[PDB]
Structure formats: structure tokens, C-alpha cells
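Exercise 7. Predict the joint structure of the components listed below.
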Amino acid sequence: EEHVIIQAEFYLNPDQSGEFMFDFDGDEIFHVDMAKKETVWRLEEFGRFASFEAQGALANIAVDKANLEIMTKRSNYTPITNVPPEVTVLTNSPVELREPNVLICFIDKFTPPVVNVTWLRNGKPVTTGVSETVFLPREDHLFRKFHYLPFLPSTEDVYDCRVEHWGLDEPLLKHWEF
Amino acid sequence: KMRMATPLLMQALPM
Amino acid sequence: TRPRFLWQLKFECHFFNGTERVRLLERCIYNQEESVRFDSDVGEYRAVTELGRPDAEYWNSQKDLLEQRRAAVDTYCRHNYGVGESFTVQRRVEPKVTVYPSKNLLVCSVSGFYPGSIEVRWFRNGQEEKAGVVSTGLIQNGDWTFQTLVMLETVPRSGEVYTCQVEHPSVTSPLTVEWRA
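Solution:
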């Protein structure tokens, strides 16, 4: 019916954080890694079907930074209002004991785009094996984001997705168990 | 002055 | 506690019926307030708030850039649609279907599918049950798959077969999973 492709960019001060990504129907096609200055495809197979010149995005972000600085002054130094995230934890598929699965932490309806996300297994943080998307755009100009944790289901273990944002009064803990 | 950023292009790869 | 300041730029290419009709919407957003936009249906920048007024005026005075922006539905939207088409518009991933009683309540779990358009139906002894059907709706997983749960409220008899049926563009014949106990 309708499809939408969005080239979405942002620059954020004082963090000096930039983002450049393409979105198709709400899924990320790719983003540009600012540090490594490289195109990163959301599904790595996409990289065999198309190319994208990372340098163009870096030039855009430099324009975005300059524009933000102009606007900041013009707005009379009006800062963003924190909007706290809604957090949902779900699994990739119906869980079965010992069958590899994925915990999905969906973080939605928030701004500015800075979050600290930590997975907890039985109270203890999980430092490796996790992955995440960049911030995805919303029509209300807030953001969403997904964090992933591959795991072997077991009635024994419990999990929390812990989310920290300046809009919250304390870390938000979304709990999961078999 | 406020700069207009560029709409950027993907390009197809051979296969 | 340091205050933050955010600038977003979005080029939205809207496609209707393939590339038959295309609309470009370029949007500038300061913090959470969209301030100025280029709409291809309009053909020039318009300020959305007082903040964007200098930008609309200044950018519209630039005739070459305006003319390139008006060509963008073609040089940009239709071009990028063409490049991404085979792996986006044409992407097909087949759902995995699981039926199980809920932890009197039967659950049809449909997961790992793309695209999002789908029809899920419940059958009892080969006949469709349209009542007592609750759905969780469409859930985007962020990895180019969706999932959904469709529940049926029942009172199961001894020899009854409930069948969950899933119609989706990835399968030429709708999938079915049977449950009985």
C-alpha cells in the first residue's frame, strides 16, 4: 500500500553525538558508525545488495551540528524536555527449555536519545553477548530502540532489563521469567 | 548561516 | 543534569502504489518542535513555527537548491526505492506458528515473519470460530521480523481439533497448526 523510506539524522549537545540512519517501514536499513566512519547494515546481507558512501553522512552530521548551534542560540538557549521511555520485555519466540531464544528489550517514546541499558541475569549484570539497534525515529519525533540478549531458557534463571534515562526518577526494571 | 543538508543515495551492487 | 539540545533532520519519502505516486517531506525539528519543512506537494519551504521562519525565507531564496529539491521525488526517493526494492519491498520471511494452552485459553503464536500484513484465523473441527478471539496485534521486533499472539477462549471437548490458520504473502498456501487434548 504505502511504503515510507526515511533518512533520519540527529546531532545532540553537549554529548556531541550524531546519528545517521535510513528507516524503511519502521525498520533500520543501515546507519553510519561515526567513530569508525563506516556504513553498518542492519541485516548484514543488505551489504551485498547495495552500497552507501559513509563520507556523505559525515558531511551531513557536520551540517547538523552547525545548525543545532545556530538554533540553540535562536531559541534563546531553550533545552529539550526529558520524555521518559516505556519499556517492554519480550522473547523472539515461544520459550522452550534449553532451546536458544532471544530476550528483546523494547524501549519506546523517549527523548533525548541517550539511554543506559543493562541486562540482569539473577540480579547480576550481563557484560558480553548483548547487542542493540541505534535510535529509531518516531513520527512524534521521539525515539525507540531495541536491545537483545540470546539465552537458553530455564525456569531457574530470572532476567531484568534495566533502563536509565534522564526522564526517569530511578532505573526502570522490566522483569522476565519462564 | 543555516545549511541545507543533502538527501543521500544508496547504489545497487552487482548481484 | 546538564541541559541537552537536539537537532533532527528527516527526509521522508512516501510511496503510494509502488512508485506511482511519491511525496517528499523534509522536516527540521529542534528538540521536539518541528520548525520548518519542505513538502513536495507544496513545492517550497514553509515554517511550521515562528522558530523556522528565517529558514523558510532564506532557503526559498535559493532557486537552484529549491529546483533540486523539487526533482528529489525522482532523483532521490524513486532512486533509493529502486535500489532497496528487492530486499525491502520484496522481502518475504515465513512465520513460525505454535499453538499451546495458556499458562480454556488457546494461544496461537506467530513469529519471525515479514512483511507485517497477515491474517490469523481459528478453526474448531474444520469450522471457523470468529467469536472469543483476542489479538495482541502487530509487534515489530526491530530485526526485520514481526510477531503476534492470537488467543481463542474455549471450553474444549474430548475429541475436538482446534486449528490455527495463518495467511501471509510468504506462503502460497496458508499455514495450519492443529491442537487437540
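Discussion. Chain C has two helices and 13 strands.
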